[PDB]
Amino acid sequence: KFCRFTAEGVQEIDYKDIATLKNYITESGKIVPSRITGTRAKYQRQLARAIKRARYLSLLPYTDRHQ
């Protein structure tokens, strides 16, 4: 529970802020569900977009296998 974004007044998630996204991706590299993390839906969508942009910029891995 405890969506960690609303309590901190987060307006937009930053794809550059890797460590936060590292908290919300699993070991294999897939996105952890909002039902697990307790994140609110709007921030969940923002988080998904940011993680995909980070994957594109090679700051996070698509999967564990390639590297």
């Binding site: 699993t26 070991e27 294999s28 564990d64």
Partner: protein, 70 residues
């Protein structure tokens, strides 16, 4: 699931950890689901039926904690 064998951990413990990692990643479920093509209508129907029965069970539980059976 990339499991590293740690020092002094027996083989049974390492294999248990690897099994749990695979089950947590859900690889086999993905493969079994991608073995055969399933039409979009079939996917939507299965999703809707799962939601309906899950909601019905939750509602039945909530009603049960309201009405005694004894």
């Amino acid at each position: 699931p990339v499991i590293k064998v740690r020092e002094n951990e027996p083989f049974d413990v390492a294999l248990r950890r690897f099994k749990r990692s695979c089950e947590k990643a859900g690889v086999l479920a993905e493969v079994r689901r991608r073995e055969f093509y399933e039409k979009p209508t079939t996917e939507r129907k299965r999703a809707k039926a799962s939601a309906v029965k899950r909601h019905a069970k939750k509602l039945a539980r909530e009603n049960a904690r309201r009405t005694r059976l004894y």
